[PDB]
Design a protein around this ligand. Sequence first.
Ligand code: NA
Ligand code: NA
Lengths: 155, 152
Amino acid sequence: HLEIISLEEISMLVSSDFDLPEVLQHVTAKVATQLKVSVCNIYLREGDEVVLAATHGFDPAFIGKIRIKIGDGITGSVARDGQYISLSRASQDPRYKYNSMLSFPIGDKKEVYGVINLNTTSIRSFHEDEIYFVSIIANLILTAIKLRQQVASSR
Amino acid sequence: EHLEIISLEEISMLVSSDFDLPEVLQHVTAKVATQLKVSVCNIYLREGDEVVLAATHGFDPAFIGKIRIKIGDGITGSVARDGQYISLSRASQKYNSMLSFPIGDKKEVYGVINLNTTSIRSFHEDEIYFVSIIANLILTAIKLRQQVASSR
Ligand code: NA
Ligand code: NA
């Protein structure tokens, strides 16, 4: 939402005394609650795949554990192509579900660094600026990485 | 605390692709001035043995080229050299209060952000914080633009 990011928040995000791990935990937990969604994950490009880096929705236990091969999911396509997809599906496993997800890339000019997902179990449309809001977050996340990775291991 | 005093596109432009340093700074100033309800906000950043004016709110923007301060020199010089910021009040005559805060990192000072009122007020712990934050924001606005350009 409009004026909806604390000074503490951008602060922590930029200021380098924190490690990605801890920021991203707070990022997902921020986004998930802001958009009223029941889970928000970040996967970060690593080799030809993409591994989980933060959650709000899963156990933190799952942090290293989930990997999507590159083109593989619809996460995997977002990771490959760098266009986000948002969809709602009707789903039914036999038994004598109607979810929504938003899957948005983290990337730049050159390429994709990761994917942020938002999944709610309700049938619900993602509104434009709802996506705008995540677009900004995808870029604050992009900026966290860039500051830390390069300006740390080379400065 | 630290109240919800920043805006999505403000944030955005800060980081953004083809949003541009002068212009970004020209807004950053105008925000601070307007926020801390201060008369002038000027950012000087670093060139060689001196520090030049990069953005103002409060002066004619025609002075952006034009004000260069040696690192030994101002109250602004000290802040630029030894990195730890200074804030003062003078009653001088009329009068003025000011905050001269550093922009930098563990090793290196990148410039100085400056506020002056033409009242006589000493700024709150919380008001400085804000500015410290604003100074990381400027710092990284800077830091991004040269890791993109000057390392590709
Ligand atoms: Na997911
Ligand atoms: Na000044």
